[PDB]
Ligand binder design. Sequence first.
Ligand SMILES: O=P(O)(O)OC[C@H]1O[C@](O)(COP(=O)(O)O)[C@@H](O)[C@@H]1O
Ligand SMILES: O=P(O)(O)OC[C@H]1O[C@](O)(COP(=O)(O)O)[C@@H](O)[C@@H]1O
Ligand SMILES: O=P(O)(O)OC[C@H]1O[C@](O)(COP(=O)(O)O)[C@@H](O)[C@@H]1O
Ligand SMILES: [Mn+2]
Lengths: 522, 505, 460, 500
Amino acid sequence: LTQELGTAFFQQQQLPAAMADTFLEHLCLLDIDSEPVAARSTSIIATIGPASRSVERLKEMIKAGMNIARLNFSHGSHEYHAESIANVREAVESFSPLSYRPVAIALDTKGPEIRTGILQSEVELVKGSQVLVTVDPAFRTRGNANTVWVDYPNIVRVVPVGGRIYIDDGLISLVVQKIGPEGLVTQVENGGVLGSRKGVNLPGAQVDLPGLSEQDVRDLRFGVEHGVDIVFASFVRKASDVAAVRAALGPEGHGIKIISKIENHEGVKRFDEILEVSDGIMVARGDLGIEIPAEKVFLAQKMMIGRCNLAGKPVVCATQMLESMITKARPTRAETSDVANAVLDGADCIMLSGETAKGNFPVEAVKMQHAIAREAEAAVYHRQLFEELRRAAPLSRDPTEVTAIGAVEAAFKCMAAAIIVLTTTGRSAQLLSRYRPRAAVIAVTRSAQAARQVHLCRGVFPLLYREPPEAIWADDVDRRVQFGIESGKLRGFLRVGDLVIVVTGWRPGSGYTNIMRVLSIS
Amino acid sequence: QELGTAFFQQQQLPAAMADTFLEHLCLLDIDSEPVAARSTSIIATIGPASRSVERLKEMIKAGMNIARLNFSHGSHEYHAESIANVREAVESFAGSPLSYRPVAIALDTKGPEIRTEVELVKGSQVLVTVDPWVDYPNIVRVVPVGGRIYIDDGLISLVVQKIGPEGLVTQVENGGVLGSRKGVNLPAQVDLPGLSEQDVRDLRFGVEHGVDIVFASFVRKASDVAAVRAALGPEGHGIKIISKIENHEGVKRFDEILEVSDGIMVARGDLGIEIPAEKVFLAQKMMIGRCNLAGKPVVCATQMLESMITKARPTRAETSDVANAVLDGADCIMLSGETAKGNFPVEAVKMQHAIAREAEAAVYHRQLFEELRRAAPLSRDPTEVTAIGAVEAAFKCMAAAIIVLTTTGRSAQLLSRYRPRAAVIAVTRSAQAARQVHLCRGVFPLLYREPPEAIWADDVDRRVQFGIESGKLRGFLRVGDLVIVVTGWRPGSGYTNIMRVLSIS
Amino acid sequence: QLTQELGTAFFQQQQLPAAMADTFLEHLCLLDIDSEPVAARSTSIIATIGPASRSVERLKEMIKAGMNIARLNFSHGSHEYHAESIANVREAVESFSPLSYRPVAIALDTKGPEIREVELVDYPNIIYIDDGLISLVENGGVGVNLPGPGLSEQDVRDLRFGVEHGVDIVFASFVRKASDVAAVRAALGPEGHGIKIISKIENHEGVKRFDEILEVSDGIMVARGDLGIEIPAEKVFLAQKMMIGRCNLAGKPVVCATQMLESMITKARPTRAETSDVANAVLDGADCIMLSGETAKGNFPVEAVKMQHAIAREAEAAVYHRQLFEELRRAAPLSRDPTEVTAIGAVEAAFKCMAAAIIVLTTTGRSAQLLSRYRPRAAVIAVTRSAQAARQVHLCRGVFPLLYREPPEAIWADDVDRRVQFGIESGKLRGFLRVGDLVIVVTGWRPGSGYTNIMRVLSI
Amino acid sequence: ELGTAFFQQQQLPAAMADTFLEHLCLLDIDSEPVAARSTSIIATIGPASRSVERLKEMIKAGMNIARLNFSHGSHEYHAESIANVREAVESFAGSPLSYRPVAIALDTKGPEIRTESEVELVKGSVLVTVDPAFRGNANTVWVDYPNIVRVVPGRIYIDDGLISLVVTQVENGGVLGSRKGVNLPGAPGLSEQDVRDLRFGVEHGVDIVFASFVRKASDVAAVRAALGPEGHGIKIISKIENHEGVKRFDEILEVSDGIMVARGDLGIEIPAEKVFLAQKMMIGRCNLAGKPVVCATQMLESMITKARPTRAETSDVANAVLDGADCIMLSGETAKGNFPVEAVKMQHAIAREAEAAVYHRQLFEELRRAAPLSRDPTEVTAIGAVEAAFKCMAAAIIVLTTTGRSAQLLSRYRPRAAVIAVTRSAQAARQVHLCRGVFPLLYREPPEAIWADDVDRRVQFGIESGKLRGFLRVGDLVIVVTGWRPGSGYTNIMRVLSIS
Ligand SMILES: O=P(O)(O)OC[C@H]1O[C@](O)(COP(=O)(O)O)[C@@H](O)[C@@H]1O
Ligand SMILES: O=P(O)(O)OC[C@H]1O[C@](O)(COP(=O)(O)O)[C@@H](O)[C@@H]1O
Ligand SMILES: O=P(O)(O)OC[C@H]1O[C@](O)(COP(=O)(O)O)[C@@H](O)[C@@H]1O
Ligand SMILES: [Mn+2]
């Protein structure tokens, strides 16, 4: 034993469960009185909307743990989103270099959306009643309790008699009874309050929408123009869908990370080819749980998180994680469970939508995800996870890859408080994070954009280094390492007496990481 | 491999053969359809939405296995009617002995409940008084300054500022809109009796009405379980006691509670107010793990498909929660408001059924069996020895079922504790044992109604054949399947000691 | 734990503390020289017959010391010589209650393509000599091997002689390929179809074509002597461990052979390397271990047999069943064969309750063999009416054959029961079983081989 | 991954196996060893191996440690053996890049009891007498242990336990020679003689002491005291040779630098068939503790008179390596036999094959688990370096070390990569031979003015010596382990380098 740290120390952070010999025994030893210690490592994405646009609200959200701001281009004009970007940047800047928190900005594309029209504000579609789905432009604004208009003309051709049409998060359901010149005549399977311009899903259908629409292209170029850090690409179904996105971003947008949203059957089945050309993945559960049966989504989520973990690429879990918090101050027991299990599954990021975009408790929702993620991360059975990742990852002659596993192994040996890594592009930090160390990965960089983008990786804490280079390079390295230490002390990551692992390289420029050193904090 | 090319793509079998848990997850396939019968039992709570005989018939057909009676509300007369209705619905299917589904009835006690539309402003001062306000006098004694009072599923909170003869004077920590007769939680030293006067009458009622199970509220320690068992008396010796773990003490004193209980319920509603909400998953996963290890039923409860009270489809987190409770190892999953009072009680049961079926197929048996087998203690008890032997055998040949004759359910429970992929088909003459075994994942009770053969060995064979016949009718078994048959060497319970490998003809 | 009521002394024996360790390394760290073996020795001992062990009286002492299989080395001696050896073994075996009768197998070891006092400073189609001592580089010093023919005429004649005298096993010398095994099976003829064929792997080609050879063989011998000349001596252990592993996986007997206790040819006690070599052969997973010169011509034949027995017993207790069972289990394929399914259920069950034995009824040995392959700690007590199957199952580790002599009862179920009781009484007398023990009993649903499908848990 | 041929060698196909059983099944006689032989070879000095000419051939054959058996020979005899070893070793010092440090170990006589007509003891029929007037016949046995009468009353073993007695009757008879070893299983510390032998050892700069019949921790403290202040840097290897040593193993290992499984005596003191249990146990616990362990006695016994070993002897050598022995030893085979050099070459050939057959996947996982957390930077750097070496199939781990300790901490994890240890301490270079897979390079140049330059220069020496010896080739990856300041105990850096 080691009374160097204290008896108390080994009772915290689920350490008694960490040393179990089987997963089952690990579960049996989890302890509600064992308090988390490590800094929360899972990234929190918060969607911007009326409830979170204010600069003052955004500062509270950043303080609560928001790492990435999501702009939902399904709604709002370019000017609206420009203002969103503006407020985030002002919140971020209006807080010492040692305490600065970068926040990334992600553009979530509209994609192949089918939507109903504006009624003549709320109507009801009685169960059993008959409703006409029309593409007749005359009925564009003539929507009512028996007549639904949709903005997808070819719908009348892709939905056969008997086919189903979902409206508003798949809540309203219609089954096609008769196809005619006027449109699909259907019977309301499940009724409800239909509003204006609601989402439509055609599960079985062979939808013929572009994939990257003319609008999407304009939105993406807007993103490049305003320096967004990440793009969440909607309805990615194949490698060529990601190429389209890359192309639309152009020469100037080559540094933007592409996270492919998997939202339908084809995307799940062509996952491998998609992950191969993407920077990361979003499990987009909203559309996915309508496009495939709701009861199969967890299988897709667990499979996708697993393959991303193997590949060392960021994966996001999204949609309805704390839904009830849109109107209530506390989440349901299923929602807390869902956040915790997403972390335990292996997610790099978890996301909030309505909860922060439009609900009454946006800051509370961020705080709740932070509290859950922190408990969950301590409950991860590193013994099994590290060993399985280690044995699956392939032999490597890349010195950055070799140094990373050595560093994470070393960290586990001494209960390192942190691994401090210098990085130009984020990569050295990324290859560390993929082994899921318990130690915080403190990444020191001069690239403001890499500092934002690295928030996609679990357990990476970016520090933006602002000072001009020293005349002597080895001196410049050492100074950044010290910046990382002093930042970590300030933020409560590090204490005098802690051991850290320090990861650097042998020459300037990206790609030369090759050194690990074991340092005591003084 | 042999005799099935399409067979090995289904039921997540490609993932089943994975060499590591990570590779197993990576191999899960949305196109791999479940084959096995759904094995996790579904508990539905009876209420206005699910109390009529016609609605109960639809719920039985949708998959409900246990009917829960919530004694926090309703008179004895009301509950007697609920029970009569469940029994009427259940026996409406009795005409088909081969296709008949036993349904258990569980009485969920009221327990030590404390109760109280105007809005409580935050920062303001509210007056808590037991002067004819909460229905619990000693509240003004068990709360020290700066201690916390939760009201209304923990949505509203208060801290004590002044302790006076007019009551407890408190400010509003978390404000909200109050209401009437709303639940109060005090996370601290409540003296409220382990078992109230009302609780004792309710348990007597349960016994007089032949309930199969008691869910005991707020079990804190072994002695609370003994009090329930005393209250049930000699007439109720056969009733299973499931201890509800709902607060910090219960979680801490879990082992002693488990040792004297028949099983456990993770009562996440109160638990999530009594301890911080973000810790409940830790308690859930730990309690399920320990129950699996001990071979005792564990129930996951509360708010699993909450939004289906008003919506036709659940949220993404709700489906995830159900699937993960099954993957955690829960024997049963539960529905409350979703069936008691909601607009979609039958749809709620059907959704749990569909999710559980998918989740069950995703279980990584290779690791689970190895870990349960190893952690379990050597035993010279023939029923335990036979069970592990039978489960090993079923795994070896991908048996369609293990058919077991049981008087008390015990031989079936012992099979269940190892999580076979094979369905455990339990043939019994005991109506009550047939109902109670629903507490065990993957046990499918068949009630045998024929009087004994003169020759005991012939009577055993008839019952095994009954097992096979119902199995075929229900789609558990088909010609060319292998089954494991578990029996005993003499009549009477406790003598199970034989397993046989049979081909279905 | 709870079963501590079976004794605190009980769980300190047969390396049980090492048994429950969670890693192999921890298992080694817990091996304990004061933890005494309990189970009957399970690895079979094969003793070569020669001038030191022809005596009926000597053979009786050897059977008593633990010899299970008598090996006739047809590399030397006329047919009449071997017929006399066979005669003596049989008379020793028979001149001993049916409850204690120990069957002894007889194996014929073929001569093979052999090639045969100065101080060097018969194959016409014509370089090591004398056990590879002299070569070749060039190691002049005081039997020839050419690392760079087939089923001889003599071999064919010997094999026919083997069938005439009802030998139980053939060890086929220098098997290099599947067709070599077919030639042996041919020479044995219709009348020899029941004789077990153990292929001797003795050169490079045989090691390289191991898989196809094992597929058509009943088992394998690691013939160290020629092997260690045909390939570099320092590579033999690799061949041995590989072949033993694959036979284990396949569930077919494998024999380790050759200089296992060599020094005991002239000395009363073996060397430290020798005791180590025997224990490691058992730990590797060998079904049988063999003695050659040690029993054929040496001065301490009975002592050699006793020494292998003593070492084997200690080493079997030291097997890390946790890992072995798991690995065999995970490696063996799903099976719809009821005997296979029953066998794994019985061994699991035996492990659950620390069964004293698994008692199995068998006609051909098969049911006992499929139990054997999972390497249970419990003794496999196999009851058979076939005297030949009773001898042949000595090839399988952990199988104790009992030869049942009574004619069948009128009611088959009764005859089954009677044989099960025969197993129990035999096991009691021999000290396998004690009142209060649990045994696993494995039987079948109809008479005749191939219908094993039942496992029962019984207390004595 | 360059070359399908590369992955056929060094039992790599078996290395990748998912279970131990499958690893065994994949072992391949055609898969040639690549790595340098890593298990250390101890040869005993005797008439067959004493001359400078023979010792040179022995060094070339692979002897790493010369053992001096103080059970026989005078101080003058052993001083000559030491001088001879040193002359032979320094005959190669002219090539700093390819020179092989050889350790000298003193093996104490210990509490030995001894008894050329050669009479015969007939079974069933003997007088065990200490009457000092006997110089012994077919019924008369005199022993140099006066207290024998009081202590035994009970079996008495003579001559490597070949003869036994139970005044006594013969239980196991045989020919009895002159002055034979006597064993008394089931009940004097350090000899006045042992004390002089140890003082002699220190005065002659021996590197290691093999202490005979260590029964408990105090026996080791006694050796340490006898070595005194000038002998503080000498490694103490405790010989476990009887029942009490085995039962008190843990307390002995705690205070020892290492262990020898002395199978000769152990095989007489406890039943012969139990020794393998003692061996595998002791090796496991030493591997666990990260301390060297030696397997000894009769490993290639027949080679005393034969040019080639038996099949059991080769198996014994290979299994000792597979068990986890850091060192293997030859006694009579080199001290007095006809083929001392051939014995050394044979252990080298076998060890090399066995090392390739080690299932690192499981071994590294198990050693890593069972090992305790450490906040010692040398221990933390070592596991990170070994993990990194495994990740890239590094050809070597080059480590700078003053005392050998940083190299030892690398060795305890059993890397496949050779541990090339560069040191200025001649004695540390000899002493690291006790650790499997450490290859000591003695660096002889005076310190650079600038310490960082001196460090770099020594790493380069490491690389150049490595290329000459065949450890390293252009395009290989190496892990370099160094420290942040001069002096022992400051190792804290690992670097991944390409060999140009
Ligand atoms: O993670 P990346 O992008 O590969 O960058 C790591 C690089 O950072 C460094 O530590 C220092 O680089 P700079 O001085 O150019 O910022 C290099 O040694 C190393 O190659
Ligand atoms: O699981 P339980 O309750 O112990 O009952 C198992 C019992 O069932 C039997 O198979 C048949 O018993 P009955 O004929 O008395 O119903 C017995 O052989 C065995 O002891
Ligand atoms: O293994 P040891 O005995 O602790 O020696 C390692 C030492 O060698 C060094 O690498 C160099 O030390 P020197 O320059 O003093 O030889 C140190 O940085 C380190 O502390
Ligand atoms: Mn979507």
